[PDB]
């Protein structure tokens, strides 16, 4: 009873998640977030046929063709995690226990608004002799690529959050120790 | 062959209580469930059935959480709906598995001897004559969808399931056939003129038999039969009668079927 | 207080004076379930007496099988003294080897 | 709530470890879970009760122990690269119920523990153009030469832990793709408006708590020892 890869999915937008138990006889269902660095955390549990809402998370279930759903309205990139989902009841699959499905990776992409394509050099502060410059204010339909250079290191996308100013920005860090390092020649 | 799991719960005061199981498959009893035990204590060797350890543990946990919370629920109930003690509650439960697709199964709770709520379909239904409190406590019983959920599947499912093992592991047993040792004897004559003429047949397995006076091919219209009676080995006894007049007596016989006697009856005359 | 019991008292293989037997009273169809069985042996009740698991019938009265292993004679007597809600004086109902 | 001990371990082949575990719920079932990259949650042992312990998916190289209805300690015999994972311990209150997962353990079991190295903290100051163009400053952190992946990054502004305007990288670079005992390197940002940069009042720190070797274990190595210890750099606001 299992779920599939990969889903990427922008700002505000509803997000369906399904588990699919065919062929098995389930009772109860469970719903679980993961976060980077973070253990799992129980969203929804559902035991009857049909939906249940929580906020924004509406869990639907169907005993008859046996598969089972999680919507996310207006999703968040807070939302932005791993969503495994459970199964028990079935005497003959663990004897009852719950059966865990593999897991679904979620990004909700931020509303970008304002774009600005800068790359701005940092000094460090205790050593005045070492750089690193960062691709701040990055398009959420850019992707950041690899360095193909084992001199060159380059950082995956990541998004900050101001919790006053209600301010988002997908920032990049990059960084080599190399004779001469350029800021444009770095980025690829 | 059904499956029939009796529950004897007793409530002497607020404080005192009693609870006690037992299951039969057939006649057999399979199972026993005392109020000390933590555990369901298994009678036959084939009572676990076909279920695995794992599968056994589990069914054991949800009977354990059921005893405690049946407990707690009708204490709350005496408290809420006002009843006083003493209290004797008994649930009758389980399902027949028909050769060779079909199943029914129930679940029927009574309230100081007569009947007050069974399980239907989806929720606790009450009986036509159950008083108005009764109705009360299905509004209360019917709003945790989690436990009519939970019934649902165990009847509907594991029933049948454990039926269809219990039945395969045990086969043997429940077709086995001791013979019957039968004698006569004369009863307390209710008449100066008459003598009552009785006919004992003990140790007989399985509870079906037919115990009839006769005179010769004709049956006796004046036969009294008594109720078939256990023994302590999982056997039975019968005690057949006819009142007649001590002329009578002379030529009288009485035949006895059971599935032990291969196709040769007891017929043993006065 | 609600069904009165009935008392049958009965050996397990036809009576034979000398040869080991064993007694059975099946204290049969009662509400409700406190009820108390002493098997007596010429008014003396039998310590070593074993007893079925208490269950009821589909009316939903109860019954019970009180068993013990003896010996019968013509000068001892048995019998099961059972006292019920119900009844106003424990019944004794003695043991018969005609019926 | 499911607590269990230790957060992180970096430990050599071959030598015993009992991650602990506790539950105060009152719970009958507890399980111990690994995950890994692909496979997911795998079950390696449960108990459904004290003094009953039974077999999951993957129970081989771990023995378990239900003495109390509260511990549910896993032991590793002669722990392998094997089982270089992720631990998480769950608590139920029945076998139909929803588990309450703990914040898990992270295992480290490595064949020479040579390769054990601490942190290289240094906070990089903000650019002027980034102050001068969009009116924000972010401060980028950047930690790296650590093995293995057991720090964990906090921002502390003026004595106080900080979690707004904090972005770090969840998954950390290797510095070199082909060697298995590679290095790793970890990047996080802090941004804050052009008024609290500027203030020459305000402070800025960045720790980096590091699990490392404890001072009871041996160290022949002539270098400095890799202990558990939060390697912090400095960094001032300026007006100019
Ligand atoms: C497959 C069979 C194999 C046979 C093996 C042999 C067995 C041994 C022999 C005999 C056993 C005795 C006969 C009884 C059989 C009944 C089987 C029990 C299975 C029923 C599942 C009930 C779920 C539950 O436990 N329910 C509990 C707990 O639920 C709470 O906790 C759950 C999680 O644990 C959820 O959170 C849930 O929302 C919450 O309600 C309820 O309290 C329930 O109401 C107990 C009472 C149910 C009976 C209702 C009838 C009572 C009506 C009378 C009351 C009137 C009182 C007058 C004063
Ligand atoms: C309940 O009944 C038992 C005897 O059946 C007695 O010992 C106990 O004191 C009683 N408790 C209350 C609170 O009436
Ligand atoms: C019945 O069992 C409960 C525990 O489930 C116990 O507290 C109680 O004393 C028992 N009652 C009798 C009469 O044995």
Redesign the interface.
Known sequence: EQDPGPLSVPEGAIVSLNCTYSNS?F?YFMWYRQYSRKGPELLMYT??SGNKEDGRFTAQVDKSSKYISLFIRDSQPSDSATYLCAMS?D??T????STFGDGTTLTVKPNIQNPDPAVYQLRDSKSSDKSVCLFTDFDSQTNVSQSKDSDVYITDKCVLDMRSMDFKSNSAVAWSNKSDFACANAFN | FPLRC?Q?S?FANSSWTRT?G?A?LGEL?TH?WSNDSDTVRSLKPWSQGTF?D??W???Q?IFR?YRSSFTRDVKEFAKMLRLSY?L?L?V?AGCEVHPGNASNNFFHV?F????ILSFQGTSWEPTQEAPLWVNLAIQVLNQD??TR??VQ?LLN??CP?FVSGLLESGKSELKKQVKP?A?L????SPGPGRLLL?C?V??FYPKPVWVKWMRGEQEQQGTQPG?I????DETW?L?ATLDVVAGEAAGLSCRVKHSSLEGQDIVLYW | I??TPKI?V?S???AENGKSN?L?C?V?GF????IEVDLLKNGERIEKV?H?????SKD???YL?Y?TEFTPTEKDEYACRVNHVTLSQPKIVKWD??? | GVTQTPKFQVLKTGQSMTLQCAQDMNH?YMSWYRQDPGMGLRLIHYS?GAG?T?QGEVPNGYNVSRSTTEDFPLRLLSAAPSQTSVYFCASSQ???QPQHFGDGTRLSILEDLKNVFPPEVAVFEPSEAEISHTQKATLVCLATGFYPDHVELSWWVNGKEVHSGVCTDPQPLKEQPALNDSRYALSSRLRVSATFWQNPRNHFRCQVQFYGLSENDEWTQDRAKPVTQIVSAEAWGRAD
């Open positions: 006889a009772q035991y009857s009841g005497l003959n663990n004897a009852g226990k | 009796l004897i007793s006690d037992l039969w009893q026993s695995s794992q599968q543990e589990t069914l946990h959480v003493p004797e008994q009758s009574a100081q001897g007569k009947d969808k989690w959920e939970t599947w499912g594991t399931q040792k004698w004897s004369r009863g307390p009785v004992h003990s140790g109720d009676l256990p023994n302590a006894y005690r | 609600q069904r049958q009965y397990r293989h036809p064993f059975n099946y049969s509400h409700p379930s406190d074993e079925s698991d208490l269950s009821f939903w009265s109860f099988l068993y080897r005609d019926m | 009958e459904v009953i039974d029945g076998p139909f």
